Design a binder for this molecule. Structure first.
Ligand SMILES: CCCCCCCCCCCCCCCCCC(=O)OC[C@H](COP(=O)([O-])OCC(O)COP(=O)([O-])OC[C@@H](COC(=O)CCCCCCCCCCCCCCCCC)OC(=O)CCCCCCCCCCCCCCCCC)OC(=O)CCCCCCCCCCCCCCCCC
Ligand SMILES: CCCCCCCCCCCCCCCCCC(=O)OC[C@H](COP(=O)([O-])OC[C@H](O)COP(=O)([O-])OC[C@H](COC(=O)CCCCCCCCCCCCCCCCC)OC(=O)CCCCCCCCCCCCCCCCC)OC(=O)CCCCCCCCCCCCCCCCC
Ligand SMILES: CCCCCCCCCCCCCCCCCC(=O)OC[C@H](COP(=O)([O-])OCC[N+](C)(C)C)OC(=O)CCCCCCCCCCCCCCCCC
Ligand SMILES: CCCCCCCCCCCCCCCCCC(=O)OC[C@H](COP(=O)([O-])OCC[N+](C)(C)C)OC(=O)CCCCCCCCCCCCCCCCC
Ligand SMILES: CCCCCCCCCCCCCCCCCC(=O)OC[C@H](COP(=O)(O)OCCN)OC(=O)CCCCCCCCCCCCCCCCC
Ligand SMILES: CCCCCCCCCCCCCCCCCC(=O)OC[C@H](COP(=O)(O)OCCN)OC(=O)CCCCCCCCCCCCCCCCC
Ligand SMILES: CCCCCCCCCCCCCCCCCC(=O)OC[C@H](COP(=O)(O)OCCN)OC(=O)CCCCCCCCCCCCCCCCC
Ligand SMILES: C=C(C)[C@H]1Cc2c(ccc3c2O[C@@H]2COc4cc(OC)c(OC)cc4[C@@H]2C3=O)O1
Ligand SMILES: C=C(C)[C@H]1Cc2c(ccc3c2O[C@H]2COc4cc(OC)c(OC)cc4[C@@H]2C3=O)O1
Lengths: 96, 80, 105, 98, 347, 314, 167, 171
């Protein structure tokens, strides 16, 4: 009985993973626009904040390479409120 | 071979059952025909995204769509 | 002495946990996979003496990916100037950085 | 760098200075040694989880297992001292000065 | 101890040293040291007396503290390099902690304060294992991290080991403590030439292991643990006094003996690198250990001694003790200097 | 709203532990050809209330303790661990739904021996300390087979998730492929909670004979707060009930009935046998349960591979 | 205040070690190391190392410190202690005041004073914990590691039975 | 170093698929069946460019083709799809297995009114090939020039000139 039911459960797991796979391009596109949205907003707010500071280049990369670096958590949620910060940094860990 | 075995089955049946189940657990996956399908199911389980290939021009064994007849299939798993 | 038994016999005892760029379970990348790959491919075969001076930029990019000291320093500077302009009152936060805009996706 | 790493290293150095110069119970020395192991576990875990380096996730368990076996070995030495003097006072371990 | 279990435990000591020698991952280095310590603890408690329990507890605490410092060094290496290769380190703090931890495992000064005690508390065969086989693994790790070793730290530890091993054995009548301060002095001699030429470090390691193995094998062959019992050897076996003569003359560095071979080469590799004062005062301190060796063989090995009547019973029995490799080790510990360019096989 | 869920977890735990004393005394009474309490309440229903009030107004000892602070920390740790064991239990939904609830419960039940050890420390009686050390060695002995049996079963579960274990037994009870694991598990949980035939705290004087009626009623009830939990855990582990997601109370009635029958099975075991000698249950663990448990752990490692029945990871 | 919770636990962790390295007794030293193991385990659990946190609870606290308390019970039946305690506590709180008034500190290394929520990653890992699959890799990729660890534990059993015999 | 280039907010505006995860999960098999080509062109561009800024327009095509996927559901089979994703939406793990008759009604109405065949077990996890016109990135890591390797050993091995040359040892 456990043989038949675990084979059935592996088939069901493959079905769930293929639903995930079929949804992953849309989630990837939304995630890319999400992070570029947050970086562009942080760039404009840095451009309107960091004018008093001399010798400051707004949006200056800290990396010597020109390759795209995946944005860090404090790069994206660095200028937002503590509720969204706490959600995005410990929500999954603290979820139930 | 049966006097010592009946003697240990009369004195220590716990250890006889222990060594027998342990011996079966060791030797039986080398004799089962279903041990191949364990490997086959654990490699058929798509944890990652099936990253597509750039069509160079000559890849006949790669499908152009999930519903195309070429590629790996799981009919062996749907039947079993 | 480093008696290289693993290369002489051709066995892989512990090369697999050695770097982050190695084959991981389920193709999980490390966070600094690209930086460590670039620094390893720079420093390969040229020896450690030439690697310490000729692969400095890849190693600085990789160490700064690992520790994020420059990124946290820049975030400190921006957040500190922002706190100064909030205390002075010459700046106000926008509605998308105060939490009043109902996020995108 | 990260600020929690400073606290874990400071904990390691506190238990290291607690091990080194006190001349007290031997069990207190083993407790300082396993506090050093605890701080190494926490620090290795936070680094490996921080960098998402997946194959080293089995590394702190190894760091646990060996060292806990090490701890067992130390207790047995203590028990042999506890079968010799009746105490684990390390000033009873002065036969080998001469 | 059951001889099968003794074989298994000695193979585990050897296996831990091999894992430190061959592995490319720092965790396996740490594992090999843990395996080596865990396996060597029963070899010290072979006779089951309170001195061996004290010696094993002190050895456990020193090697455990050293292993924790080694793992902290590995962990800071992981912070600042994100990887695990047993090569040069990527932080001077990891360099300092790993040099300190390996100095604790070798018994170098200022962490020398267990080596005369532990060697005193354990038998001669386990002291042989401690002073010869337990030097191989940390010298291998020091051999592989020498691009990161701070020169001032390794030279401070080296000359401190040489001075303390010199001025610690002047007072000693116990043979195991003489060998232990000799160990500390020779580890100073090995680690001072490490950043200049590591092949001469390996040469000093092998010549030291040969001479130490010769000395402990003669000690087991005569069952002498003190100076005064060593003086009672000529009336039992006269050749054994000759062999402890020539081997103690070799360990201090007399020409034309083989123990003059490493340190002369070490001076030969330190003046190339324009260091003149350091090997000078280093060999000045080695003259002090040679000098108490010459007191310990002139006053108390050559000129023949008052004996005891029960020794005339011991004339009627030969040595049935297995003196394994003792003539080979005695020839190699004395007569090897004409083959001084053999060192190139260690390159 | 979550605090209401925590309270409706933990207050009915203490009420069920209170009335478990009545069920114990009544069921032991009728098995011993007599009655249990029937005077104090109608059918004895006010006996635990009168007993708890009676204990809470007795004079405590407050003896000369080696540690006052650990004399305080032993009931607090006992009750806190006895209440936190229930929070991942899926009935059919848990208070805290966590991915590693099985390993959580294993770790928190391993933490329960400090109550016994600190209660042996806090009494100055060295014989109470001896009995505490024997109790601790008993409990850490049977934790080994708890861990290995639980590992062998979770090889058929697929994860450490306690709610997945309901999905695992949707066709068959897990006592059918794992009844030798189930019977060694049941006897090992019996030996975890210092429960007869494994109790060594009534005769050759236990670790908690220093406590009188202030902390004792708490210790005891924390102890019975483990017992029901272990049976509920056994009910989740080998006797998985039907779960309809649109009517969860079908699962709640079904697992409640099975857990009641299994706690009554504890009561029915202790009324039927004499006790073990201490080295006899050490002989039972180290020489009878542990070789079989290792053999069946090898069997449940190799068995899903040889039948192509490896369970899902998620 | 909730954003710094890992940091807050780390402070308690440091305090916990100064709680027991002052060493009033191996009894209270064990108690301080158990509380320290709990709070450092909370540190580990707050980064997503749930299996490693339950290895702290099951094996370090539930397995090994039980044996330390057991041996402290059976084998082992002020001014220096309280002074070292308050000395280490004053050192740690002055460090906290420095790093909170400066958001930058240098004792040995350079350390940022913001919270460590910034240094995380913004991605997901699908249907698995990466830490769980990395520990599962002990049986597939970690063959030599399993061999040397099992041999060390077997030798550990043999070594304990040798030196505890006394014969 | 340099300034990191970011696209403007107008370059990121696209009409979002503003439906829930159970709605996406309900139609996910027919989504992977019918929206194959733009999704795979996007994920090919996304694993090859290694840069989301170079993957905006293909991503917009994803968000162009997903919405047309749902409009084509909303014009034809809104009620069986709604009855299906509501049942998917009840479950805390979102089980497909609890919802087979609503799945059958949705699949029946989709095959009748749209001709779509649901993918089988093992199809959407296939590695497929993608014919695009965009060029292959010649340096996706933006790596600089690698250092030149050390010169290898060549030449036949001669004996040592007068031996070790160690002080007086002539061999
Ligand atoms: C390469 C490195 C080799 C290092 C040495 C390896 C062997 C020694 C280590 C193991 C050991 O203890 O073995 C016992 C050991 C005897 O040691 P012992 O007890 O101290 O000897 C005292 C008496 O000889 C005890 O006598 P006995 O009454 O028991 O019987 C006599 C015995 C009986 O012999 C036999 O039974 C041997 C025949 C059977 C062998 C097994 C067949 C299976 O013959 C001998 O022992 C003759 C002397 C053997 C040579 C010893 C030294 C070997 C050379 C060491 C390296 C020198 C390097 C110089 C470098 C200079 C430049 C830097 O060796 C043997 O019995 C056989 C030695 C074979 C040498 C082979 C060399 C080529 C290797 C390739
Ligand atoms: C067609 C195919 C077949 C053809 C067959 C032809 C041959 C037929 C005859 C077969 C026998 C051949 C014998 C070996 C070849 C000749 C060796 C020779 O004379 O070397 C000259 C060698 C240098 O002279 P040369 O004019 O430059 O070379 C002439 C030849 O062309 C020498 O050749 P080289 O120029 O190539 O020399 C190379 C180089 C030349 O050397 C150098 O470049 C300088 C480095 C030498 C080492 C310096 C070390 C100093 C510190 C240690 C001192 C130890 C204490 C002194 C000895 C105490 C007792 C052990 O050698 C070395 O560096 C190796 C070390 C020296 C080994 C000498 C051979 C020893 C074999 C017998 C051992 C018995 C004890 C001998 C003395 C041991 C001390 C050396 O002389 C010395 O170094 C002085 C020592 C005396 C030589 C040994 C004579 C061997 C026969 C002894 C019989 C009496 C034994 C009495 C009982 C035992 C003693 C108590
Ligand atoms: C979870 C739901 C409930 C589970 C069942 C439990 C309910 C019933 C409880 C009854 C009261 C128990 C009170 C406590 C009793 C404790 C004492 C006791 O029983 O000790 C255990 C005794 C101990 O032995 P012993 O004490 O009887 O004998 C003394 C020991 N010797 C002989 C060594 C001197 O037995 C066991 O350990 C058995 C444990 C379970 C064995 C499972 C065997 C599986 C069979 C596999 C196949 C075998 C066939 C051959 C091979 C075939 C291969 C294909
Ligand atoms: C007693 C020894 C029992 C185990 C022997 C090795 C078993 C095995 O199949 O290992 C394969 C494994 C792994 O090989 P593999 O065949 O799984 O390789 C596939 C590649 N990976 C792992 C990336 C999926 O180990 C090795 O091949 C090398 C390491 C161990 C070699 C044996 C050491 C024995 C030491 C004895 C002392
Ligand atoms: C190869 C298969 C896998 C093997 C490895 C895995 C084993 C799983 C179980 C682990 C058990 C761990 C402990 C085992 C100890 C064995 C030695 C032993 O117990 O010997 C002593 C015993 C006599 O008992 P005594 O010393 O008095 O102890 C007090 C009890 N009276 O003497 C005995 O009990 C005699 C024991 C030997 C005879 C047992 C024969 C069993 C045969 C079963 C069928 C065949 C199984 C195939 C494998 C062959 C096994 C021999
Ligand atoms: C680059 C590095 C790579 C590796 C290079 C190789 C390094 C070699 C290091 C050798 C270290 C040897 C340590 C001692 C041997 C190990 C086993 C042992 O201890 O054997 C001794 C044994 C004990 O028997 P037991 O009964 O306990 O004796 C008590 C007396 N009743 O029996 C006895 O006590 C009998 C008495 C005689 C024993 C003599 C043993 C001599 C061993 C050393 C040989 C010389 C070193 C090898 C050559 C040089 C290598 C550098
Ligand atoms: C003498 C001192 C006092 C003694 C009496 C009081 C202490 C003893 C009784 C209480 C014991 C507390 C144990 C707390 C941690 C238990 C382990 C744990 O949290 O596991 C559950 C879960 C892991 O599962 P997972 O599903 O992966 O997590 C969600 C991610 N989706 O993980 C999670 O869900 C993570 C949730 C966030 C992190 C939780 C951290 C809890 C606080 C840290 C420990 C506090 C207690 C310290 C003392 C312990 C005992 C000494
Ligand atoms: C928790 C509540 C509400 C009350 C009721 C209660 C306690 C504290 C302790 C006990 C208890 O109920 C019963 C009373 O009678 C026996 C009699 C026993 O044997 C005759 C026996 O054996 C183990 C056990 C017991 C329980 C026992 O100890 O607090
Ligand atoms: C007691 C110890 C440790 C040493 C010192 C010592 C002896 C034995 C003998 C003598 C000795 O002192 C030396 C002093 O100076 C020279 C100088 C010599 O040559 C430079 C010389 O040549 C034989 C002989 C001598 C003394 C000599 O006979 O053992």
């Amino acid at each position: 009985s456990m043989m038949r039911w675990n084979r059935e459960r592996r088939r069901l797991q493959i079905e769930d993973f293929e639903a995930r796979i079929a949804l992953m391009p849309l989630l990837q596109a939304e995630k890319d626009r999400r992070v570029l949205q947050m970086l562009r907003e942080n760039l404009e707010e840095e451009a309107t904040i960091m004018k008093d500071v001399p010798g400051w280049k707004v949006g200056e990369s800290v990396f010597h390479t020109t390759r795209w670096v995946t944005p860090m958590m404090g790069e994206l949620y660095g200028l937002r409120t503590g509720e969204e910060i706490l959600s995005s940094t410990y929500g999954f860990i603290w979820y139930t | 071979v049966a006097a010592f075995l009946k003697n240990v089955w009369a004195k220590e049946p716990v250890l006889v059952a222990s060594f027998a189940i342990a011996g079966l657990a060791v030797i039986l996956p080398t004799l089962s025909p279903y041990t191949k399908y364990s490997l086959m199911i654990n490699r058929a389980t798509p944890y990652n995204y099936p990253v597509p290939l750039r069509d160079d021009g000559n890849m006949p064994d790669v499908p152009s769509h999930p519903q195309d007849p070429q590629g790996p299939s799981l009919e062996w798993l749907k039947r079993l | 002495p480093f008696f290289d038994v693993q290369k002489k016999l051709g066995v892989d005892l512990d090369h697999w946990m050695t770097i982050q760029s190695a084959e991981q379970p389920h193709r999980i990348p490390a966070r600094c996979h690209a930086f460590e790959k670039e620094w390893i491919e720079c420093a390969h075969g040229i020896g450690s003496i030439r690697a310490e001076k000729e692969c400095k930029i890849e190693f600085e990019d990789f160490r700064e990916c690992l520790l994020r000291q420059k990124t946290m320093k820049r975030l400190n500077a921006i957040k500190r100037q922002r706190d100064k302009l909030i205390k002075e009152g010459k700046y106000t936060p926008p509605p998308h950085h105060s939490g009043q805009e109902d996020l995108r996706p | 760098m990260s600020l929690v790493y400073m606290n874990i290293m400071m904990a390691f150095t506190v238990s290291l200075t607690g091990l080194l110069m006190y001349r007290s119970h031997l069990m207190s020395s083993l407790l300082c040694l396993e506090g050093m192991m605890l701080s190494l576990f926490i620090l290795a875990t936070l680094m490996i989880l921080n960098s998402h380096f997946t194959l080293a996730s089995m590394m702190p368990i190894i760091l646990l297992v060996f060292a806990a076996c090490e701890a067992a070995l130390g207790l047995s030495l203590l028990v042999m001292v506890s079968n010799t003097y009746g105490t684990d006072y390390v000033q009873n371990l002065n036969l080998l000065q001469c | 101890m059951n001889p099968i279990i003794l074989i298994i435990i000695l193979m585990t000591v050897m296996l831990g040293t091999i894992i430190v020698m061959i592995s490319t991952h720092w965790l396996l280095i740490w594992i090999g040291f843990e395996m080596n310590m865990l396996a060597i603890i029963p070899i010290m408690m072979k006779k089951h007396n309170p001195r061996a329990t004290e010696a094993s507890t002190k050895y456990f605490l020193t090697q455990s503290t050293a292993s924790m410092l080694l793992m902290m060094a590995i962990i800071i290496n992981l912070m600042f390099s994100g990887q695990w290769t047993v090569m040069k380190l990527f932080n001077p703090m990891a360099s300092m902690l790993m040099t300190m931890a390996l100095a604790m495992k070798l018994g170098m000064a200022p962490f020398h304060f267990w080596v005369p005690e532990v060697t005193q508390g354990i038998p001669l065969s386990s002291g042989l294992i401690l002073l010869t086989w337990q030097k191989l693994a940390p010298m291998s790790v020091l051999y592989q991290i020498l691009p990161s070793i701070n020169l001032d730290l390794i030279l401070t530890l080296s000359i401190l080991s040489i001075t303390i091993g010199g001025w610690g054995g002047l007072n000693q009548t116990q043979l195991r403590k003489i060998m232990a301060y000799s160990s500390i002095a020779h580890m100073g001699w090995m680690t001072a030439v490490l950043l200049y030429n590591p092949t001469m470090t390996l040469l000093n390691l092998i010549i030291y292991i040969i001479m130490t193995s010769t000395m402990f094998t003669l000690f087991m062959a005569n069952s002498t643990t003190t100076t005064l019992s060593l003086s009672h050897t000529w009336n039992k076996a006269p050749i054994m006094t000759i062999l402890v003569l020539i081997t103690l003359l070799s360990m201090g560095g007399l020409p034309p003996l083989s123990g003059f071979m490493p340190k002369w080469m070490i001076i030969q590799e330190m003046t190339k690198n324009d260091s003149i004062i350091l090997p000078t005062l280093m060999a000045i301190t080695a003259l002090l250990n040679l000098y108490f060796y010459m007191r310990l063989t002139y006053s108390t090995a050559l000129t023949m001694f008052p004996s005891t009547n029960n020794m005339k019973m011991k004339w009627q029995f030969p040595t049935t003790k297995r003196m394994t490799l003792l003539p080979t080790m005695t020839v190699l510990s004395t007569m090897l200097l004409p083959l001084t360019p053999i060192l190139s096989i260690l390159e | 709203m979550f605090m209401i869920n925590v309270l409706t977890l933990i207050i009915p735990i203490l009420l069920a532990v209170a009335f478990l004393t009545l069920v114990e005394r009544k069921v032991l009474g009728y098995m011993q050809f007599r009655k249990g309490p029937n005077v104090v309440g109608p059918y004895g229903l006010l006996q635990p209330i009168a007993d708890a009030i009676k204990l809470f107004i007795k004079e405590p000892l407050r003896p000369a303790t080696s540690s006052i602070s650990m004399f305080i920390l032993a009931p607090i740790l006992a009750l806190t661990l006895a209440l936190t064991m229930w929070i991942p239990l899926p009935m059919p939904y848990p208070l805290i739904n966590m991915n590693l609830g099985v390993l959580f419960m294993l770790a928190m039940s391993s933490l329960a021996v400090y109550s016994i050890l600190w209660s042996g420390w806090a009494s100055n009686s060295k014989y109470a300390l001896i009995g505490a050390l024997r109790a601790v060695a008993q409990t850490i002995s049977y934790e080994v087979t708890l861990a290995i049996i639980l590992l062998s079963v979770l090889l058929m579960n697929g994860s450490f998730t306690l709610s997945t274990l309901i999905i695992t037994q949707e066709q068959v009870w897990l006592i059918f492929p794992a009844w030798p694991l189930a019977m060694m598990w049941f006897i090992s949980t019996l030996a975890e909670t210092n429960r007869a035939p494994f109790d060594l705290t009534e005769g050759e004087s236990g670790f908690n004979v220093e406590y009188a009626a202030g902390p004792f009623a708490l210790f005891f009830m924390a102890e019975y707060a483990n017992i029901i939990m272990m049976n509920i855990f056994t009910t989740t582990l080998f006797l998985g009930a039907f779960h309809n997601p649109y009517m969860p109370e079908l699962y709640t009635i079904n697992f409640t009935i099975k857990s009641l029958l299994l706690s009554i099975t504890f009561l029915w075991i202790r009324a039927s046998y004499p006790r073990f000698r201490y080295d006899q249950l050490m002989h039972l663990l180290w020489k009878n349960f542990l070789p079989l448990t290792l053999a069946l752990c090898m069997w449940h490692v190799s068995l899903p591979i040889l039948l192509s029945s490896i369970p899902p990871q998620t | 205040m909730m954003t710094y919770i890992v940091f807050i636990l780390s402070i308690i962790f440091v305090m916990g070690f100064v709680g027991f390295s002052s060493k009033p007794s191996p009894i209270y030293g064990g108690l301080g190391l158990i509380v320290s193991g709990g709070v450092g385990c909370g540190i580990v659990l707050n980064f997503g190392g749930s299996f490693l946190g339950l290895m702290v609870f099951l094996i370090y606290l539930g397995g090994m410190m039980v044996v330390f308390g057991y041996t402290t019970a059976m084998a082992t039946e002020n001014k220096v202690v309280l002074g070292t305690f308050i000395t280490g506590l004053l050192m740690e709180f002055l460090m906290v005041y420095y790093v909170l008034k400066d958001k930058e500190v240098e004792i040995v290394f350079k350390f940022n004073g913001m919270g460590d929520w910034v240094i995380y990653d913004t991605g997901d890992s699908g249907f698995f914990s990466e830490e769980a699959m990395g520990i599962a890799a002990l049986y597939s990729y970690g063959t030599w590691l399993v061999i040397v660890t099992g041999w060390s534990l077997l030798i550990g059993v043999v070594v304990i039975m040798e030196i505890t015999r006394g014969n | 170093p340099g300034i990191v280039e970011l696209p403007s907010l107008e370059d990121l505006k696209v009409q979002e698929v503003k439906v829930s995860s159970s709605v996406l999960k309900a139609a996910a098999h027919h989504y992977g069946a019918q929206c194959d080509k733009p999704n795979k062109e996007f994920m090919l561009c996304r694993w090859e460019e290694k840069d989301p800024r170079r993957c905006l327009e293909e991503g917009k095509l994803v968000n162009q083709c997903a919405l047309e996927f749902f409009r084509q559901i909303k014009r034809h089979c809104a009620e069986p799809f709604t009855e299906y994703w509501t049942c998917i939406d009840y479950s805390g793990l979102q089980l497909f297995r609890r919802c087979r008759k609503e799945q059958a009604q949705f699949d029946k109405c989709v095959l009748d009114k749209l001709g779509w065949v649901r993918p089988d077990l093992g199809e959407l996890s296939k590695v497929t090939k993608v014919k695009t016109d965009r060029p292959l990135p010649e340096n996706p890591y933006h790596s600089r020039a690698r250092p030149e390797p050390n010169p290898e050993v060549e030449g036949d091995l001669k004996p040592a000139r007068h031996g070790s040359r160690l002080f007086f040892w002539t061999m």
